[PDB]
């Protein structure tokens, strides 16, 4: 499930952040509001962050 929306996601939009399919829209980081193209995923405490914003913040 997409823990941001609370909505179950499956193979169609299944982009696995934290071992679970998120919405590709929410396969993002909420810092910038940027959706990530399938990859570019970095998990931090259950929250998804862009590899770009990761390099900026961390
Ligand atoms: Zn979502
Ligand atoms: Zn971001």
UniProtKB/Swiss-Prot annotation:
One of its GO terms (cellular component) is nucleus. GO terms for biological process: cardiac muscle contraction; cardiac muscle hypertrophy; cardiac muscle tissue development; cardiac myofibril assembly; detection of muscle stretch; glucose homeostasis; inflammatory response; insulin receptor signaling pathway. Positive regulator of myogenesis. Acts as a cofactor for myogenic bHLH transcription factors such as MYOD1, and probably MYOG and MYF6. Enhances the DNA-binding activity of the MYOD1:TCF3 isoform E47 complex and may promote formation of a functional MYOD1:TCF3 isoform E47:MEF2A complex involved in myogenesis. Plays a crucial and specific role in the organization of cytosolic structures in cardiomyocytes. Could play a role in mechanical stretch sensing. May be a scaffold protein that promotes the assembly of interacting proteins at Z-line structures. LIM zinc-binding domain 1 is required for self-association. LIM zinc-binding domain 1 and LIM zinc-binding domain 2 both are required for optimal actin-bundling activity. LIM zinc-binding domain 1 mediates binding to MYOD1. LIM zinc-binding domain 2 mediates binding to SPTB. It is linked to Cardiomyopathy, dilated, 1M: A disorder characterized by ventricular dilation and impaired systolic function, resulting in congestive heart failure and arrhythmia. Patients are at risk of premature death. Self-associates. Oligomeric in the cytoplasm and monomeric in the nucleus. Homooligomers preferentially form along the actin cytoskeleton. Isoform 2 interacts with isoform 1. Isoform 1 but not isoform 2 interacts with MYOD1 and MYOG. Isoform 1 interacts with TCAP, ACTN2 and NRAP. Isoform 2 interacts with TCAP and alpha-actinin. Interacts with LDHD. Interacts (via N-terminus)with GLRX3 (via C-terminus) and PPP3CA; GLRX3 and calcineurin compete for interaction with CSRP3. Interacts with MYF6. This is Cysteine and glycine-rich protein 3. It comes from Homo sapiens. The lineage of its organism: Eukaryota, Metazoa, Chordata, Craniata, Vertebrata. The chain holds residues 119 to 176 of 194 of the full protein.
